[PDB]
Design a protein around this nucleic acid. Sequence first.
DNA 1: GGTAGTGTGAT
DNA 2: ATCACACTACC
Lengths: 673, 105
Amino acid sequence: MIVSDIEANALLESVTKFHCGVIYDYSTAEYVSYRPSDFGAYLDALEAEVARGGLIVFHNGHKYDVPALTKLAKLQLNREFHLPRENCIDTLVLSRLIHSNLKDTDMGLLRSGKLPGALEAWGYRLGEMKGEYKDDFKRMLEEQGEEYVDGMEWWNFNEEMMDYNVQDVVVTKALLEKLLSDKHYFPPEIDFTDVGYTTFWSESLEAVDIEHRAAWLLAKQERNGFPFDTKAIEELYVELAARRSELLRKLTETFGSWYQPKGGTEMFCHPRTGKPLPKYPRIKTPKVGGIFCELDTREYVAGAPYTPVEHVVFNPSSRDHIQKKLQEAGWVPTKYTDKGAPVVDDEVLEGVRVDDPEKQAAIDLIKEYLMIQKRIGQSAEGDKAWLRYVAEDGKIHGSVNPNGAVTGRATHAFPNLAQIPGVRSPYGEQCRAAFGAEHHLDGITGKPWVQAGIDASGLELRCLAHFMARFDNGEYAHEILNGDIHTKNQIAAELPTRDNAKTFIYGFLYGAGDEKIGQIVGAGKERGKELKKKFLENTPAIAALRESIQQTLVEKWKRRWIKGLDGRKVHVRSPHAALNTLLQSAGALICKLWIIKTEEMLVEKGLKHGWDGDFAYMAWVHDEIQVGCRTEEIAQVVIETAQEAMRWVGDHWNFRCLLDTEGKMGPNWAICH
Amino acid sequence: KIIHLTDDSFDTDVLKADGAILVDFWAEWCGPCKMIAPILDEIADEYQGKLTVAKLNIDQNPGTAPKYGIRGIPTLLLFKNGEVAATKVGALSKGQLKEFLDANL
DNA sequence: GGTAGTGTGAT
DNA sequence: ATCACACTACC
Ligand SMILES: [Mg+2]
């Protein structure tokens, strides 16, 4: 087993030069440095470890060092270099699994300061390395009276860089051993720094093997990217921009501008008493100035105070502005936030009722305005707007933290491709249609690719059915696939229609309170404790499931975690959200193993993963995958194969409810909904 | 004595007055404004038939102030034949005002 | 340039 | 319930 790390001139997307690399070999207990001209030798040492059936350890190597070396070996040495998945260990992936309750800076892409909670120390050091190397570089430069440029610290190899490369390996090794000392994942009777790759995967907890496979697959998905229709979004942007302007024109006419105190320094004091008046706006007492002798054109006069003010135009994006105008119109806020401000969201705005019919109509313009900005910010103007992220290859390469949530779910960012507006929302179809396999033209034939969209069917309800089978003997599961559980829940809840049930159950599983529950419940909000009571009464298995989950966690805690489908610990934040934690976690792990198996099956069928092949994973959004396929025949095979893999997963973990998938073929995300 | 202006009456009441019009842009929430208010009431009488004291509340008439670049209040604008002759920002005293007017008149 | 406070986007 | 990120307002 060896631990390694490399330093190169740029992020994966544009790396062209290997600067240096370090290898610590457990069999020799030694560190070896490789400088720019030792690149070939560096690669040879990694392949020698592979020939021995060994293991190579990197920190964030799955997403960076490994694909970077393949790219770099081809460019610099004309060599084919591909470390096999099974010979690679990633301490970042390991840290995110074992310390799944803690956040991390995602290797310096996120500022430590805004992250909540504590951070694991070695992983924090690794994530800050680039910034610390930069700081040293900059101050070393200033010492020589030289100027600093953009990111020149990465243009050329130097010894400071070599020293940091060595430090990464000492820290990565330290991290490795700390993670390897967790007996829940690694049995203490085995020295995992002294075994072959096959032993490492089979003797450790299944979660370890699964997380590395997921990070390996998703790293490739990131590299694939999602074909994006820039022109179509630039045109939607023009359309939304004109509607925003028109709504602004109409609103600033209805709600005129006003004045506000601004720039005042001195406290206003009563001229008679001398008593400070903090509630009054601040003032400014002109230092100089006088009436006249040549008259003084100066407008200020010493001693004569005044209140500095600014002119402010109505801003529809300001809940403060909206709050001010609607009350001056007669609106009396019914609900406030914990800070003193009244709630001003689409829901409240929908219920505001003022006299002036014009100002009453202006409310809808305001709601429209807010929704338009939401779309403009997400697609074009936001910091993480799609238009700022589209790469040269015509694709958006969103990042994915394979195990970003405590439940085992992944998190998406830069931009978040898991929050694209749905077809059922305003401008959703156009947004959705811009992400699609059709926007990718085959590298050889130039013909557009086809999209295969597949999602797990009612995964959340089946996970519930599974866990309650120990109490109802498969009854709830049986009803899901052979009857109508929605009518069944309806009766148990005494709810009006069957559609009320789908809203109730899916809501019951995603939190919600008596208010939201009682809401769609005909209308009568609140007093939604009766609906949520008559339900658990006519569905005793669920209540029973909850009792058992608690007897496991409390009494003060007996244990602060839940065991996931693959054995991992899943931190429970609240005894009340425990069942939810259990269900979301199971759905997450099922979907994770599922996308893994699906890809392995496609590959064992002869299909090649990549734009230069047959298919390409474009996105994984919790319970669905969007896959690009060179031909329709391949799209159909992916759809069928995803169903086989889902069934394989259900069998793999002895699930008490049959698991299924539904697939749709088409040109983009809007059609594969 | 004082003329209470509005956005719609400002043009004819001030710009086309042809006489002597001192306008005070003020707001109910301004401390300084509350200070000169009593003063202006006295100036109106004493200068009757020599000057016209007019007031424009900027919360009630948001349209006129911007056209003159108001940055602070109270703002005293002395209009002569539709134009701005003098200008002064701040709660002047009864004396400072008498001087401002007597001079600029 | 950075942190709250509030809300929306999706599963 | 889990989580990304936008826009205002204040320092
Ligand atoms: Mg590294």
